[PDB]
Design a protein around this ligand. Structure first.
Ligand SMILES: *SC[C@H](NC(=O)CC[C@H](N)C(=O)O)C(=O)NCC(=O)O
Length: 106
């Protein structure tokens, strides 16, 4: 449990943009599209493709972020929120500078 938390923390530190996702979730597909449009290639972890580990990672995500929904977006090692939250940062003009500070590749 503490190792899983540690692994999540490393994941978000190793990658400019991380999206914890589920393949079927429209909001997740939507935030992935936004990143595609902004020429970012995030690390996408599909919780529904992880079997038993999926619910385990989500437990950790809820502890670290306060959020129980997907997508769970991180940029530059920092929790952003979900699709709607990410889109808010975009509309406000704050998203691209964050992606730059995170050195988002592509
Ligand atoms: S599609 C799966 C569900 N996601 C959302 O409802 C995300 C909405 C947010 N406002 C956003 O990301 O934009 C989901 O995670 N359902 C699980 C549940 O417990 O409701």
């Amino acid at each position: 449990g503490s190792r899983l938390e540690d692994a999540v923390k490393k994941t978000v530190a190793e990658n400019p943009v991380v999206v914890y996702s589920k393949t079927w979730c429209s909001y997740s597909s939507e935030v992935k599209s936004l990143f595609k449009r902004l020429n970012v290639d995030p690390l996408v972890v599909e919780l529904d493709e992880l079997g038993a580990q999926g619910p385990q990672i989500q437990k950790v995500l809820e502890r670290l972020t306060g959020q129980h929904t997907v997508p769970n977006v991180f940029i530059g090692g920092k929790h952003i929120g979900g699709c709607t939250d990410t889109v808010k940062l975009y509309r406000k003009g704050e998203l691209e500078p964050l992606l730059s500070e995170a050195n988002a590749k592509k």
